[PDB]
Amino acid sequence: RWRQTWSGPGTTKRFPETVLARCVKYTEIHPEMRHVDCQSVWDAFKGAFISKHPCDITEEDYQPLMKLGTQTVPCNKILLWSRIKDLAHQFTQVQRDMFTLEDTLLGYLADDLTWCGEFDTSKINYQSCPDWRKDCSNNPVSVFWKTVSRRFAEAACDVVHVMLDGSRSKIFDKDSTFGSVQVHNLQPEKVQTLEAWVIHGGREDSRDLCQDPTIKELESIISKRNIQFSCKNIYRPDKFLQCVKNPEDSSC
Numbered sequence: 001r002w003r004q005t006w007s008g009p010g011t012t013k014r015f016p017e018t019v020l021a022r023c024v025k026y027t028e029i030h031p032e033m034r035h036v037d038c039q040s041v042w043d044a045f046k047g048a049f050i051s052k053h054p055c056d057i058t059e060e061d062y063q064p065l066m067k068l069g070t071q072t073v074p075c076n077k078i079l080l081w082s083r084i085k086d087l088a089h090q091f092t093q094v095q096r097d098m099f100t101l102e103d104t105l106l107g108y109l110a111d112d113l114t115w116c117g118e119f120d121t122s123k124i125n126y127q128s129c130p131d132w133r134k135d136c137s138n139n140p141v142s143v144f145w146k147t148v149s150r151r152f153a154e155a156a157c158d159v160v161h162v163m164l165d166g167s168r169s170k171i172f173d174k175d176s177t178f179g180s181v182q183v184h185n186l187q188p189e190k191v192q193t194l195e196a197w198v199i200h201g202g203r204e205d206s207r208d209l210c211q212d213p214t215i216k217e218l219e220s221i222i223s224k225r226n227i228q229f230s231c232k233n234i235y236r237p238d239k240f241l242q243c244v245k246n247p248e249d250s251s252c
């Protein structure tokens with residue numbers, strides 16, 4: 001029809017089959033995740049949002065699933081990223097130098113998906129889901145990503161890397177999940193340094209974005225939590241990926 005309940009697009013078509021298949025698949029590639037029963041994962045997942053008003057979703061609603069998806073990612077090789085999805089993934093895919101959220105079982109199950117149910121019903125709503133901004137922040141998708149992103153920051157140790165999109169005017173954005181969940185949930189007992197990689201978008205190597213006002217902010221935020229801060233520009237990310245694929249491949 002012409003109206004729709006919510007302002008957001010509705011559940012990714014064939015959601016259950018997709019999440020379940022992604023489960024099987026991930027438990028096939030990654031051997032320390034073969035104890036996982038995928039149908040169980042699915043039931044945890046479903047039970048987090050099915051028959052709940054999709055604006056009255058909590059982190060607790062997700063804890064059964066967070067328990068089934070329990071995973072150790074080497075705590076010193078974590079790559080956080082904000083608003084620069086594709087470089088972060090093309091990077092970790094070369095030789096697994098680092099792990100992003102989407103290299104975890106849970107992050108790989110939800111990545112690029114949308115889901116919600118209805119209060120009155122056990123039906124998945126394929127027609128519309130709440131919008132973070134126009135409707136409510138406590139919706140199935142937003143709440144999932146916040147909880148998993150928190151846990152993932154809290155898992156991290158030693159030198160933690162963040163990739164940031166330097167093409168944005170707010171390179172460090174206090175209102176992103178990085179700036180408002182992860183930055184606050186890095187554990188200062190365990191995290192020695194946050195190292196920012198500011199990924200330039202063009203004219204190759206523009207200004208030094210490590211002097212960006214928002215970057216001086218991130219820095220003082222992190223310094224006052226007693227974690228050291230370090231920043232590096234990445235001028236040509238294409239060249240940076242070719243260097244990672246072939247170190248000492250002429251410039252690298």
Ligand SMILES: N=c1c2ncn3c2ncn1[C@@H]1O[C@H](COP(=O)(O)OP(=O)(O)OC[C@H]2O[C@@H]3[C@H](O)[C@H]2O)[C@@H](O)[C@H]1O
Binds near residue numbers: 101178
């Ligand atoms: N993998 C996704 C993803 N795929 C699609 N989407 C994802 N959101 C977050 N995640 C991950 O959580 C992190 C934090 O989410 P956020 O920066 O708020 O994405 P935003 O720039 O706020 O984009 C959020 C929206 O983009 C969709 C969701 O439908 C909805 O969460 C992201 O860095 C990313 O690792």
